[PDB]
């Protein structure tokens, strides 16, 4: 190896290699944010496509 000043001040970061929570850990919380993110993109995708019009939005070059 070859430790170095910078190398040391960092060591504690690249140290928990295999470290892993047990079982299905935060997974269900993850499944919730995902599905949440998914629907949001669909809301965007559908605004841009104008398949979901909204008051005051209007997707044209018109604005400024």
């Amino acid at each position: 190896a070859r430790r170095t000043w910078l190398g040391d001040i960092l060591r504690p970061l690249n140290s928990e290699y295999g470290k892993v929570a047990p079982g299905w850990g935060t997974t269900p919380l993850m499944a919730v944010f995902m599905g949440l993110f998914l629907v949001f993109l669909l809301i965007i995708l559908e605004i841009y496509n104008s398949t979901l019009i909204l008051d005051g939005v209007n997707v044209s070059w018109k604005a400024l």
Binding site: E46, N49, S50, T51, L52, I53
Partner: peptide, 11 residues
């Protein structure tokens, strides 16, 4: 129609 998805329940 455009590039509209044409969702049965759409505009």
């Amino acid at each position: 129609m455009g590039h509209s998805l044409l969702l049965l329940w759409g505009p």
